[model samples]
Target: GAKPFGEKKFIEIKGRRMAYIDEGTGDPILFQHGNPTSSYLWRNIMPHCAGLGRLIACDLIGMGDSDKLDPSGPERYAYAEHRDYLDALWEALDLGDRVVLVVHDWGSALGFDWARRHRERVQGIAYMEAIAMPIEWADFPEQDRDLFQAFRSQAGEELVLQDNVFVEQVLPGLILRPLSEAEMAAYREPFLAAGEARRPTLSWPRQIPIAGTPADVVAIARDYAGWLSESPIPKLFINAEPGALTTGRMRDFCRTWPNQTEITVAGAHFIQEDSPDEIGAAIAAFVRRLRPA
Candidate 1:
């Protein structure tokens, strides 16, 4: 028997429907995905840990089968907008103690933000290729700086809005291996219409906190940075060589964080797709090692 994404569940958010996957039963293990992907990213990973705990992954608003908000609206693709919707969903699910978060990409920032507020309910966090804190402009790698800078420019808008580049170019290029046609379709299907449908994809790059124009978002990252350093909750940084978000300086910073463990994994930016099995096993081992508080 294959473990699919489980029953497609829906929750009403501001007159829109958001989709999520909830599977198995045990302590909660919440999975959060970033841009250009959905709950589908965790298909392989969830199975390995199905016996360990309940697995839940959600499609951020305007992505996956979730309803799309007006992209032209000011709140459409902002981090606060995405986070607010997630907050409602989190409350709706009523997920209780022993909550372990597995987050990647933009989901890292959002997950850390939520975890910071509800520190007691969270058990542990395991992250790969995540943006957990504010990044100084000087610390950025030149390649990434160029990528995101273009993403914020008119050329970037053409790629994301008109060309649908995130799903078409960014995802496939970032992963270590080529995605199959089916896999590509799974990602491409949602953004086929482009324009407003591409707003979420367009909005995320601008929020990367590089130059820190979105000062409020940077503030949230800073707050979580403090939480990560001080909190006794166990943290696992599953890092990849040649990765995004987790640069050399970031890894050095992680070494000093309390109650944290680090593991070097295979693959690049989109490590989940490149090495799901290794990630799953690492997470399982990490969970087992945790002493119950």
Candidate 2:
């Protein structure tokens, strides 16, 4: 079933109310989503992982139901700024060190970065369709490279901001299954205002860390890659049949990391949307082994 997003619980971060679903209390099993998605991304998947821990699926600042930052600060929604708000949100929630990260896309990069910094507190991580490391121009699929390159170039604003293509076209295009009206409408709500309101989506592609263009993000991903390689944390790296990200070579690189177990979900980049039950069950099993029964 395609469950709807749960009731929102709001928390203040950087003076903005970030919306989230706080359920099944215990150690936090935090779920982080990528650009243009919120805690709602885990709506269908959250139930399967219930009772394992406190499920915290938060809307990244400025997306989903969360309040947008003042549009005047054109540079505000970039990586370091988002990281700053994440830091504040973590402190606000008092998540402590017992976080079990369930992350995807840009979320994986953020989760891994946090785990590396707080090694003592971060227990394990389960990721799918993720950006676990820096990518090269050659890493993207041959067919998709031109379009992605344009997302990082002068044309991105017209396609993403003015036309609002990421919400209107990209999400449905990337997902293997067709989205229903309500589902599609929910994703578009945040960007309905258009232009500067969609800054987060526009900025994400520009900062994709491809071929060392965004040097700082590349450096950050490099640090996290080193951590994932050497750190002994239990990891679940779930791939897909035709994923939007994490190409085959990328999967091979992720497999080289210590304690990283790989699994294939029968879906695309938005695997949670296509195979939420399996994704949730897989994560539940992966997480169960983290502690004694």
Candidate 3:
């Protein structure tokens, strides 16, 4: 399941200023990360999967080594900006086609949006632990509800920084195995201060596009469904069992999609960390099937 694929290198996208890891060389296999955690989330799996194809992992803006932006308001740091940033990375790298999208958590929305725009360029996707439930906003955890409302209405910066949802709820609680000193330190690397944590923490509650919301979320939902409906891109859904986010919607998600398959792994939301071997092997196998020797 694991292999010593050898060393890697990190470079910066010229415009985004986000430092990303590029390993091996072949048809591009892009690993898009989610909120709070940066591209380092793929530490365990990247090496093993590097042999399967060229790998590109990036930190979304305002997180990781990327230059942080002025978080003036919710509008400034919405998913639209992330979509553009990802496209910029692809263009900067000159990643043409045969791309395999590996997405986690918030990555679902970001990756799906990009893939939808360039559906033909995408070869497939390894989607894990993320979903867009159109009718369940009322069922969201109360804490999450209160938190997002504050964020969308432009809550004070101190209100965001003081709460520190990344360290409190997301980071410590996400993984099943306890992070080592180095592992824990990696999560902390992006945020020099609470202000650095603002985009990751605040962006979470705001990304979800409720079907009837006044903002652009309505169009986002329509686009998500559009991708699933129109595109023939192969999708492998890695459902992290005991997943914090997509717990209740597994059946409904499968039932709604046309050409998708899922495998449930045991972990919190960050299943890649909890079952690196399983996730890695699954990806390797899928890639092999698509281009058998």
In the range 72-174, model 3's lDDT, one tens digit per residue, is 4455667777777767877787677788888886787777777787887788877886654443566454445565566555563555566666555666777
User: What are the models' TM-scores?
Assistant: 0.94, 0.96, 0.86
- Selected candidate, larger TM-score, 1 vs 3: 1
**lDDT of every model, 2 decimals:** 0.82, 0.82, 0.69
**Per-residue accuracy of model 1 over 21-126 as CA lDDT, tens digit each:** 9888877889999998888888888877867778899999988878888636434678998998999988888788778999998889899899999998899999
lDDT of 1: 0.82
Candidate 3 accuracy as lDDT: 0.69
Model 2: per-residue Cα lDDT over 133-235, one tens digit each: 8888778767557878988878988888889877776677678788888887788888898678888898887878889879999999989988788988888
True lDDT of residue 220, candidate 2: 93
